[PDB]
Amino acid sequence: MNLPTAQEVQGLMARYIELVDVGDIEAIVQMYADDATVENPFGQPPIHGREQIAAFYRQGLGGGKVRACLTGPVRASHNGCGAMPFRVEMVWNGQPCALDVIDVMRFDEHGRIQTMQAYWSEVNLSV
Amino acid sequence: MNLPTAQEVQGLMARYIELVDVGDIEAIVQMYADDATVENPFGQPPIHGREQIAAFYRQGLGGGKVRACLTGPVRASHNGCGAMPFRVEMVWNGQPCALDVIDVMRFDEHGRIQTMQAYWSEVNLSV
Ligand SMILES: O=[N+]([O-])c1ccc(O)cc1[N+](=O)[O-]
Ligand SMILES: O=[N+]([O-])c1ccc(O)cc1[N+](=O)[O-]
Ligand SMILES: [Mg+2]
Ligand SMILES: [Mg+2]
Numbered sequence: 001m002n003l004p005t006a007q008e009v010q011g012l013m014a015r016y017i018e019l020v021d022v023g024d025i026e027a028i029v030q031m032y033a034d035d036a037t038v039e040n041p042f043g044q045p046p047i048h049g050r051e052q053i054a055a056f057y058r059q060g061l062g063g064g065k066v067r068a069c070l071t072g073p074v075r076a077s078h079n080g081c082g083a084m085p086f087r088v089e090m091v092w093n094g095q096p097c098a099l100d101v102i103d104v105m106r107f108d109e110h111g112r113i114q115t116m117q118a119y120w121s122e123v124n125l126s127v
Numbered sequence: 128m129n130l131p132t133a134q135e136v137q138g139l140m141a142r143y144i145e146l147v148d149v150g151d152i153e154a155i156v157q158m159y160a161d162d163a164t165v166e167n168p169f170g171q172p173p174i175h176g177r178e179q180i181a182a183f184y185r186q187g188l189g190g191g192k193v194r195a196c197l198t199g200p201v202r203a204s205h206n207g208c209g210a211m212p213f214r215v216e217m218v219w220n221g222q223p224c225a226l227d228v229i230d231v232m233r234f235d236e237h238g239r240i241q242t243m244q245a246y247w248s249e250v251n252l253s254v
Contacts, residue, residue, distance in 0.1 A: 071199050082246065
């Protein structure tokens with residue numbers, strides 16, 4: 001595809017959450033542009049490139065026991081960007097916990113994620 | 128205050144929604160830096176400065192019949208920024224309607240909104 005339309009952004013961002021929810025690290029990485037950046041949480045320096053991004057998702061999702069679901073609709077733009085609210089459920093030293101997040105994404109002219117910014121801070125974590 | 132902490136960002140952004148919900152145009156404008164920008168929706172060129180911002184809110188809220196409420200928690204950063212999901216309820220040619228929005232804000236070193244970006248597109252509008 002080219003620069004995704006608003007409807008395509010909504011589909012791609014929902015697909016991303018699906019891949020996080022099942023923990024398909026390789027499929028997530030494929031959604032990113034080869035030189036994409038991730039800022040997690042927003043406020044921290046970006047990581048760069050598919051290998052660093054793969055390392056990120058392997059760390060976050062490789063231990064298993066992670067689920068993610070949209071908590072409301074994707075809000076898309078007409079310039080290939082969008083924002084979405086979701087909750088990540090995991091386990092903290094064996095206890096269930098949740099993290100509320102908003103991701104902002106910009107897609108490139110091939111429909112790949114160029115930038116991801118994950119807004120959250122520690123008070124978005126609940127035990 | 129100085130650059131708001133994560134907790135202060137959560138308070139300021141929730142306060143903003145409160146002021147939108149009651150329609151206090153003057154109090155909203157006061158939350159913005161004198162030279163702030165608003166991008167509504169994200170993808171459109173910014174408006175600039177408190178007068179243009181006041182004109183924006185007078186247009187959006189001056190006709191009355193607008194409510195706004197968070198639909199989930201504010202996601203704040205440690206660098207004075209945050210993102211929040213909310214729903215705006217209004218009336219379209221006399222019929223109830225809703226718009227789902229995510230605002231991203233950056234605050235300045237005085238606790239005023241420097242930039243606001245409102246993510247939404249037409250399929251976030253429901254009649
Ligand atoms: O660190 N996180 O929990 C996180 C934040 C934003 C995301 O898009 C995905 C994840 N994750 O893979 O879990
Ligand atoms: O255009 N809008 O509905 C809108 C979008 C983002 C906002 O922070 C506020 C409003 N509003 O005043 O209604
Ligand atoms: Mg490229
Ligand atoms: Mg200033």
